[PDB]
Amino acid sequence: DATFGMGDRVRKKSGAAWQGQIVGWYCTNLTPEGYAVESEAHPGSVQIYPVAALERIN
Amino acid sequence: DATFGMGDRVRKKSGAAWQGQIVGWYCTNLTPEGYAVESEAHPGSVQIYPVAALERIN
Amino acid sequence: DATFGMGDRVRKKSGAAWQGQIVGWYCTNLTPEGYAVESEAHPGSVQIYPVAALERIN
Amino acid sequence: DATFGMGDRVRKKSGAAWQGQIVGWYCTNLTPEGYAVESEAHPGSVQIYPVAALERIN
């Protein structure tokens, strides 16, 4: 089912950079599999992205 | 356990406004219970907030 | 020079929806002409987008 | 007038962390003096904050 799990280390594949740990998930019609990622550089800051935008590292 | 569930209609209590449906969740040390909310006015747009920032309506 | 000015009413062209007034601007190498847009539905909430993502309405 | 200028290195004072360069500005009734900050750790990623949330470093 889910591509990533809580605590996986991921980064953005392209475009704006982001890297850190999976800390949650979301699901919309536009993004049926999305993840919340907490920056490893900026503790407490979280961004949300579609699964296609992310890759696991490690 | 969780204050809200998927599909609950919520709004921001104060400050910047946001209103729509719960579409996910996240957990960080700064925000141990956070929610993703898809705007009911702006389909596909999602913002994330701590539970203390949100209230259920309906 | 700038495509939009302060107070222009704009919306996202595609994808996640957003609509409201231009309230600022930003410039990065990835987004050399970006705008801050305050939602007309959700006062106080602001999102930032590249100019190519937005169109003026109205 | 403005507290910061383009290219100033700033960080969040408290709460969620963010650090990098001023790349824009915004103005709303809730945030009459706001700044866009591009992360120095995550090139291309930009977050917006009220001036009270930021301090100049460096």
mmCIF file of C-alpha atoms in Angstrom:
data_model
loop_
_atom_site.group_PDB
_atom_site.id
_atom_site.type_symbol
_atom_site.label_atom_id
_atom_site.label_comp_id
_atom_site.label_asym_id
_atom_site.label_seq_id
_atom_site.Cartn_x
_atom_site.Cartn_y
_atom_site.Cartn_z
ATOM 1 C CA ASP A 1 0.000 0.000 0.000
ATOM 2 C CA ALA A 2 1.936 3.105 1.280
ATOM 3 C CA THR A 3 5.258 3.890 -0.458
ATOM 4 C CA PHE A 4 6.824 5.384 2.682
ATOM 5 C CA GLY A 5 6.469 4.892 6.398
ATOM 6 C CA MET A 6 6.863 7.104 9.414
ATOM 7 C CA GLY A 7 10.509 7.950 9.975
ATOM 8 C CA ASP A 8 11.734 7.206 6.450
ATOM 9 C CA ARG A 9 14.376 9.706 5.270
ATOM 10 C CA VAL A 10 13.238 11.252 2.010
ATOM 11 C CA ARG A 11 14.066 14.145 -0.287
ATOM 12 C CA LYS A 12 12.396 16.035 -3.081
ATOM 13 C CA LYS A 13 13.380 14.600 -6.461
ATOM 14 C CA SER A 14 13.491 17.899 -8.300
ATOM 15 C CA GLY A 15 12.650 21.567 -8.104
ATOM 16 C CA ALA A 16 12.538 23.094 -4.672
ATOM 17 C CA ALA A 17 14.679 21.081 -2.310
ATOM 18 C CA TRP A 18 13.514 19.408 0.918
ATOM 19 C CA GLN A 19 14.980 16.574 2.942
ATOM 20 C CA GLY A 20 14.123 14.917 6.221
ATOM 21 C CA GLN A 21 11.833 12.409 7.860
ATOM 22 C CA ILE A 22 8.312 11.330 7.042
ATOM 23 C CA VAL A 23 6.104 12.604 9.936
ATOM 24 C CA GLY A 24 2.621 12.181 8.408
ATOM 25 C CA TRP A 25 0.384 11.635 5.454
ATOM 26 C CA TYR A 26 -2.524 13.127 3.577
ATOM 27 C CA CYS A 27 -4.956 12.160 0.834
ATOM 28 C CA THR A 28 -6.861 14.425 -1.534
ATOM 29 C CA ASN A 29 -8.314 13.918 -4.972
ATOM 30 C CA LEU A 30 -5.396 15.899 -6.449
ATOM 31 C CA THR A 31 -2.844 14.066 -4.241
ATOM 32 C CA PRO A 32 -4.240 10.675 -3.284
ATOM 33 C CA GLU A 33 -0.938 9.696 -1.620
ATOM 34 C CA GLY A 34 0.847 12.610 0.046
ATOM 35 C CA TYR A 35 3.403 12.845 2.804
ATOM 36 C CA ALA A 36 4.393 15.347 5.464
ATOM 37 C CA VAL A 37 8.190 15.676 5.765
ATOM 38 C CA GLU A 38 9.946 17.405 8.643
ATOM 39 C CA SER A 39 13.180 19.089 7.541
ATOM 40 C CA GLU A 40 16.346 17.572 9.023
ATOM 41 C CA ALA A 41 17.980 21.007 8.649
ATOM 42 C CA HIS A 42 15.109 23.052 10.131
ATOM 43 C CA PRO A 43 13.580 21.105 13.034
ATOM 44 C CA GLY A 44 9.835 21.667 13.430
ATOM 45 C CA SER A 45 9.302 22.864 9.861
ATOM 46 C CA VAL A 46 7.122 20.546 7.847
ATOM 47 C CA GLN A 47 6.182 20.564 4.179
ATOM 48 C CA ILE A 48 3.693 18.303 2.384
ATOM 49 C CA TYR A 49 4.234 16.751 -1.023
ATOM 50 C CA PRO A 50 2.778 14.122 -3.354
ATOM 51 C CA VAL A 51 4.538 10.770 -3.291
ATOM 52 C CA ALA A 52 5.703 11.257 -6.914
ATOM 53 C CA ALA A 53 7.723 14.288 -5.760
ATOM 54 C CA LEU A 54 9.733 12.309 -3.122
ATOM 55 C CA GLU A 55 12.369 9.626 -3.019
ATOM 56 C CA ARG A 56 13.722 7.621 -0.106
ATOM 57 C CA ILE A 57 17.446 7.952 0.825
ATOM 58 C CA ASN A 58 19.618 6.109 3.384
ATOM 59 C CA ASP B 1 -6.756 9.304 21.105
ATOM 60 C CA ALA B 2 -7.075 11.569 17.974
ATOM 61 C CA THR B 3 -9.209 14.727 18.355
ATOM 62 C CA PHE B 4 -10.335 14.695 14.711
ATOM 63 C CA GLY B 5 -10.916 12.080 12.065
ATOM 64 C CA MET B 6 -10.666 12.004 8.314
ATOM 65 C CA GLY B 7 -13.441 14.054 6.756
ATOM 66 C CA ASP B 8 -14.248 16.185 9.803
ATOM 67 C CA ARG B 9 -15.046 19.807 8.874
ATOM 68 C CA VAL B 10 -12.749 22.109 10.809
ATOM 69 C CA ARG B 11 -11.618 25.721 10.864
ATOM 70 C CA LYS B 12 -8.778 27.717 12.321
ATOM 71 C CA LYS B 13 -9.749 29.194 15.686
ATOM 72 C CA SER B 14 -7.885 32.453 15.266
ATOM 73 C CA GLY B 15 -5.377 34.321 13.164
ATOM 74 C CA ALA B 16 -5.110 33.309 9.554
ATOM 75 C CA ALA B 17 -8.338 31.713 8.435
ATOM 76 C CA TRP B 18 -8.734 28.201 6.993
ATOM 77 C CA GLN B 19 -11.739 25.925 6.729
ATOM 78 C CA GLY B 20 -12.398 22.547 5.184
ATOM 79 C CA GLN B 21 -11.982 18.833 5.689
ATOM 80 C CA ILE B 22 -9.386 16.839 7.565
ATOM 81 C CA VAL B 23 -7.372 14.925 4.891
ATOM 82 C CA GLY B 24 -4.359 13.784 6.958
ATOM 83 C CA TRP B 25 -2.223 13.995 10.027
ATOM 84 C CA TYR B 26 1.314 14.592 11.185
ATOM 85 C CA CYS B 27 3.369 14.311 14.358
ATOM 86 C CA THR B 28 6.523 16.192 15.297
ATOM 87 C CA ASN B 29 8.095 17.095 18.599
ATOM 88 C CA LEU B 30 6.856 20.685 18.157
ATOM 89 C CA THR B 31 3.394 19.500 16.990
ATOM 90 C CA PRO B 32 2.728 16.042 18.390
ATOM 91 C CA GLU B 33 -0.852 16.098 17.045
ATOM 92 C CA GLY B 34 -1.204 17.944 13.740
ATOM 93 C CA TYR B 35 -3.733 17.800 10.950
ATOM 94 C CA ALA B 36 -3.784 18.413 7.217
ATOM 95 C CA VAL B 37 -6.899 20.348 6.136
ATOM 96 C CA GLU B 38 -8.024 20.714 2.536
ATOM 97 C CA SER B 39 -9.746 24.053 1.909
ATOM 98 C CA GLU B 40 -13.447 23.794 1.038
ATOM 99 C CA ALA B 41 -13.060 27.067 -0.899
ATOM 100 C CA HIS B 42 -9.855 26.130 -2.762
ATOM 101 C CA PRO B 43 -10.024 22.441 -3.723
ATOM 102 C CA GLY B 44 -6.628 20.718 -3.719
ATOM 103 C CA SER B 45 -4.967 23.268 -1.441
ATOM 104 C CA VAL B 46 -3.923 21.814 1.872
ATOM 105 C CA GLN B 47 -2.485 23.447 4.971
ATOM 106 C CA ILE B 48 -1.188 21.751 8.129
ATOM 107 C CA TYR B 49 -1.837 22.947 11.659
ATOM 108 C CA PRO B 50 -1.509 21.831 15.280
ATOM 109 C CA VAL B 51 -4.685 20.480 16.836
ATOM 110 C CA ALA B 52 -4.811 23.443 19.271
ATOM 111 C CA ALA B 53 -5.217 25.773 16.271
ATOM 112 C CA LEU B 54 -8.364 23.977 14.933
ATOM 113 C CA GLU B 55 -11.958 23.477 15.926
ATOM 114 C CA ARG B 56 -14.606 21.181 14.495
ATOM 115 C CA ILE B 57 -17.766 22.722 12.919
ATOM 116 C CA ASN B 58 -20.969 21.141 11.539
ATOM 117 C CA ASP C 1 8.533 44.480 -15.811
ATOM 118 C CA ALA C 2 6.202 42.839 -13.182
ATOM 119 C CA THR C 3 3.193 40.895 -14.537
ATOM 120 C CA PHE C 4 1.005 41.709 -11.520
ATOM 121 C CA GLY C 5 0.735 44.525 -9.036
ATOM 122 C CA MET C 6 -0.326 44.792 -5.437
ATOM 123 C CA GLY C 7 -4.062 44.279 -5.112
ATOM 124 C CA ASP C 8 -4.598 42.464 -8.414
ATOM 125 C CA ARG C 9 -7.151 39.632 -8.119
ATOM 126 C CA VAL C 10 -5.563 36.414 -9.318
ATOM 127 C CA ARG C 11 -6.164 32.677 -9.274
ATOM 128 C CA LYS C 12 -4.158 29.538 -9.812
ATOM 129 C CA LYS C 13 -4.437 28.356 -13.415
ATOM 130 C CA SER C 14 -4.440 24.658 -12.642
ATOM 131 C CA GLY C 15 -3.890 22.068 -9.961
ATOM 132 C CA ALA C 16 -4.482 23.157 -6.413
ATOM 133 C CA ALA C 17 -6.867 26.077 -6.357
ATOM 134 C CA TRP C 18 -6.178 29.520 -4.859
ATOM 135 C CA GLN C 19 -7.787 32.885 -5.469
ATOM 136 C CA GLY C 20 -7.412 36.330 -3.977
ATOM 137 C CA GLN C 21 -5.284 39.443 -4.000
ATOM 138 C CA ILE C 22 -1.611 39.958 -4.690
ATOM 139 C CA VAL C 23 -0.035 41.025 -1.336
ATOM 140 C CA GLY C 24 3.683 40.578 -2.128
ATOM 141 C CA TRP C 25 6.435 39.214 -4.272
ATOM 142 C CA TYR C 26 9.522 37.054 -4.176
ATOM 143 C CA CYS C 27 12.455 36.158 -6.404
ATOM 144 C CA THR C 28 14.593 33.029 -6.342
ATOM 145 C CA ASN C 29 16.656 31.267 -8.955
ATOM 146 C CA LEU C 30 13.919 28.616 -9.266
ATOM 147 C CA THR C 31 11.146 31.272 -9.279
ATOM 148 C CA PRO C 32 12.572 34.550 -10.536
ATOM 149 C CA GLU C 33 9.101 36.158 -10.526
ATOM 150 C CA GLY C 34 6.864 34.923 -7.711
ATOM 151 C CA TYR C 35 3.854 36.374 -5.970
ATOM 152 C CA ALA C 36 2.251 36.151 -2.550
ATOM 153 C CA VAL C 37 -1.554 35.849 -2.780
ATOM 154 C CA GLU C 38 -3.897 36.302 0.164
ATOM 155 C CA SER C 39 -6.991 34.098 -0.120
ATOM 156 C CA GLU C 40 -10.262 36.003 -0.570
ATOM 157 C CA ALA C 41 -12.027 33.055 1.106
ATOM 158 C CA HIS C 42 -9.601 32.663 4.035
ATOM 159 C CA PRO C 43 -8.480 36.127 5.177
ATOM 160 C CA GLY C 44 -4.907 36.206 6.493
ATOM 161 C CA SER C 45 -3.837 33.012 4.731
ATOM 162 C CA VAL C 46 -1.189 33.595 2.118
ATOM 163 C CA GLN C 47 0.376 31.253 -0.413
ATOM 164 C CA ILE C 48 3.284 31.957 -2.775
ATOM 165 C CA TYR C 49 3.452 30.874 -6.396
ATOM 166 C CA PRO C 50 5.464 31.438 -9.574
ATOM 167 C CA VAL C 51 3.944 33.897 -12.019
ATOM 168 C CA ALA C 52 3.403 31.092 -14.581
ATOM 169 C CA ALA C 53 1.017 29.420 -12.109
ATOM 170 C CA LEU C 54 -1.290 32.503 -11.803
ATOM 171 C CA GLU C 55 -3.721 34.424 -13.937
ATOM 172 C CA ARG C 56 -5.429 37.749 -13.331
ATOM 173 C CA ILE C 57 -9.272 37.861 -13.081
ATOM 174 C CA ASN C 58 -11.733 40.777 -12.773
ATOM 175 C CA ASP D 1 10.857 51.641 7.013
ATOM 176 C CA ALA D 2 11.570 47.911 6.234
ATOM 177 C CA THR D 3 13.392 45.912 8.946
ATOM 178 C CA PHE D 4 15.139 43.636 6.434
ATOM 179 C CA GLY D 5 16.346 43.928 2.879
ATOM 180 C CA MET D 6 16.763 41.524 0.016
ATOM 181 C CA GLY D 7 19.627 39.142 0.688
ATOM 182 C CA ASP D 8 19.745 39.569 4.468
ATOM 183 C CA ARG D 9 20.454 36.279 6.282
ATOM 184 C CA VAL D 10 17.708 35.649 8.807
ATOM 185 C CA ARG D 11 16.349 32.881 11.003
ATOM 186 C CA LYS D 12 13.173 32.135 12.879
ATOM 187 C CA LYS D 13 13.440 33.275 16.496
ATOM 188 C CA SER D 14 11.468 30.415 17.983
ATOM 189 C CA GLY D 15 9.250 27.469 17.208
ATOM 190 C CA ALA D 16 9.688 25.865 13.837
ATOM 191 C CA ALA D 17 13.159 26.554 12.538
ATOM 192 C CA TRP D 18 14.032 28.295 9.255
ATOM 193 C CA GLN D 19 17.180 30.041 8.104
ATOM 194 C CA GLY D 20 18.320 31.630 4.879
ATOM 195 C CA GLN D 21 18.067 34.739 2.759
ATOM 196 C CA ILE D 22 15.319 37.297 2.389
ATOM 197 C CA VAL D 23 13.935 36.870 -1.185
ATOM 198 C CA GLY D 24 10.689 38.881 -0.931
ATOM 199 C CA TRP D 25 8.038 40.580 1.098
ATOM 200 C CA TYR D 26 4.322 40.651 1.721
ATOM 201 C CA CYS D 27 1.765 42.796 3.519
ATOM 202 C CA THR D 28 -1.622 41.779 4.885
ATOM 203 C CA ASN D 29 -3.805 43.144 7.635
ATOM 204 C CA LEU D 30 -2.745 40.224 9.864
ATOM 205 C CA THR D 31 0.937 40.587 8.838
ATOM 206 C CA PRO D 32 1.574 44.156 7.736
ATOM 207 C CA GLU D 33 5.322 43.473 7.407
ATOM 208 C CA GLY D 34 6.126 39.948 6.232
ATOM 209 C CA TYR D 35 9.109 38.406 4.522
ATOM 210 C CA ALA D 36 9.774 35.513 2.175
ATOM 211 C CA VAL D 37 12.896 33.552 3.185
ATOM 212 C CA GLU D 38 14.608 31.004 0.963
ATOM 213 C CA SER D 39 16.190 28.184 2.977
ATOM 214 C CA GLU D 40 19.995 28.056 2.815
ATOM 215 C CA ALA D 41 19.740 24.295 3.450
ATOM 216 C CA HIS D 42 16.981 23.579 0.902
ATOM 217 C CA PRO D 43 17.557 25.751 -2.181
ATOM 218 C CA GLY D 44 14.334 26.833 -3.896
ATOM 219 C CA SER D 45 12.136 26.281 -0.845
ATOM 220 C CA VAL D 46 10.624 29.469 0.470
ATOM 221 C CA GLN D 47 8.561 30.160 3.570
ATOM 222 C CA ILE D 48 6.845 33.414 4.568
ATOM 223 C CA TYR D 49 6.784 34.852 8.067
ATOM 224 C CA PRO D 50 5.900 38.033 9.954
ATOM 225 C CA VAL D 51 8.836 40.277 10.780
ATOM 226 C CA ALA D 52 8.338 39.632 14.530
ATOM 227 C CA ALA D 53 9.110 35.943 13.905
ATOM 228 C CA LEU D 54 12.554 36.635 12.299
ATOM 229 C CA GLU D 55 15.943 37.897 13.337
ATOM 230 C CA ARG D 56 18.946 38.874 11.248
ATOM 231 C CA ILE D 57 22.226 36.890 11.643
ATOM 232 C CA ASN D 58 25.717 37.397 10.157
#
